Write a protein that binds this ligand. Structure first.
Ligand code: AMP
Length: 386
DNA sequence: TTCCGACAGTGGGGTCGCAAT
DNA sequence: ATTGCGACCC
DNA sequence: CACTATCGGAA
């Protein structure tokens, strides 16, 4: 049984990367990993893999051992539940490595994830990247940009390959279902194109799309396309001009000469009941990442709340022994959890001097209230007040 | 010397499908 | 059948 | 969807 030789090289590789300090030194050690350590990293990082479980039983393993090929086979097929039923026939080191596949090797903390792994080992697994927006900042505004409604719903990319076959995928490449069938029927007439849109109810009932970008299928897969925004927009309008059904799906935009015009558009959009606005530079290219070619304008409320509780950092995290999240209440009676906005030192102070905070007032920033009345996207702005 | 892009590591509110009751 | 938790939305 | 923290090259 070659099991214990493989569990040792895996445990040795993870410890070697964790002991390396700095990003550069961690990547040169990542290049030296074995076949088996490579496979476990792929199993944890692959965004299109699932296992059905997040941890084995606390019965752990305890001697014996299972063939590493059998383990990798069970993980690849998504049979995590079957693996857990046989978990005590694993060795303890095996169960520690497998639990590390699920939670990210927290026992070792090597400090390398998808960014470092794909840099050292390109194309080890498939990823999905779309254009994302940076935060609104007038200092970065480019003159004569275009303002657009930030539509409600979910991000949805529609890709029509060269055979005319279409798939709807989400922001992270997962399938999207129940789109109006007229939409697929008409888009199949434009093979070799990907359309960036938002899916939402026209108001179960089938969703419709608001399309705001279009990229050729090959350029989309290559993650490279140098046509600027306004030309990309006009190209979409012309290729759909003869199809009125598709043409009406195109989202409108408004020229904003100055950043104060963009702010005015955002306020008009808020007055009409929309979430906010997106500002798009007329010279910006689709970059398949996050940059200021797109910038989002979203509301942000500020309120004073009373700390009424706390929760320690979850097991094996860097926040063990200090505050992971605060429990706050405001004047409406709503109770919301705040998990970010505090420095590491502030998390430790509150944990120790809990008398200073048990019912004191703090300042919380959030986007809006949910339908239940609690905060959406809450964050702490001030631990104490002056 | 500092600024910042890239990256790793935390956390929240909500919906839905399916395995295990 | 319901319950819960994995897996994904924002 | 958020914020903090750290490396290490750009500024
Ligand atoms: P987040 O608050 O970071 O905002 C980005 C997402 O907003 C959605 N969205 C709505 N409307 C648009 C337009 N017109 N253009 C681009 N993105 C839009 C997307 O789903 C983004 O992921």
């Amino acid at each position: 049984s070659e099991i214990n030789r493989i569990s040792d090289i895996i445990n040795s590789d993870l410890q070697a990367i964790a002991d390396s300090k700095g990003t550069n030194a961690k990547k040169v050690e990542l290049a030296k990993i074995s076949e088996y350590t490579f496979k476990c990293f792929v199993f944890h990082l692959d965004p299109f893999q699932n296992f059905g479980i997040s941890k084995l039983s606390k019965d752990a393993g305890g001697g014996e051992g299972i063939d590493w090929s059998t383990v990798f086979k069970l993980l690849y097929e998504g049979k995590g539940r079957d693996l857990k039923k046989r978990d005590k026939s694993l060795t303890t080191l095996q169960a520690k490595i497998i639990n590390g596949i699920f939670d990210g090797f927290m026992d070792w903390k090597p400090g390398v994830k998808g960014g470092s792994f794909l840099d050292v080992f390109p194309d080890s697994y498939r990823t999905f990247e779309v254009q994302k927006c940076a935060n609104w900042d007038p200092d970065l505004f480019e003159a004569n940009s275009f303002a657009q409604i930030k539509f409600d719903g979910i991000r949805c990319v529609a890709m029509v390959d060269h055979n005319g076959n279409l798939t709807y995928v989400s922001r992270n490449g997962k399938p999207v279902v129940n789109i109006d069938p007229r939409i697929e029927e008409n888009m199949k007439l434009h093979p070799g194109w990907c359309f960036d849109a938002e899916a939402d109810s026209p108001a179960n009932i089938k969703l419709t799309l608001r399309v705001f970008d279009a990229i050729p299928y090959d350029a989309f897969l290559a993650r490279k396309y140098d046509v600027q925004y306004i030309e990309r927009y006009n190209d979409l309008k012309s290729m759909w001009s003869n199809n009125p059904f598709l043409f009406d799906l195109i989202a409108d935009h408004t020229l904003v000469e100055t950043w104060e015009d963009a702010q005015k558009f955002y306020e008009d959009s808020r007055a009409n009941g929309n979430e906010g606005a997106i500002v798009k530079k007329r010279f910006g290219t689709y970059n398949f990442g996050r940059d200021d070619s797109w910038m989002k304008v979203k509301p942000l409320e500020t309120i004073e709340a009373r700390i009424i509780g706390y929760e320690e950092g979850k097991p094996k995290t860097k926040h063990v022994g200090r505050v992971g999240a605060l429990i706050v209440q405001d004047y409406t009676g709503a109770i919301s959890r705040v998990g970010s906005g505090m420095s590491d030192k502030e998390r430790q102070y509150i944990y120790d001097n809990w008398d200073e905070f048990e019912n004191a007032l703090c300042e919380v920033k959030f986007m809006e209230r949910t339908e239940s009345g609690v905060f959406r996207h809450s964050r702490l702005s001030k631990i104490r007040l002056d």
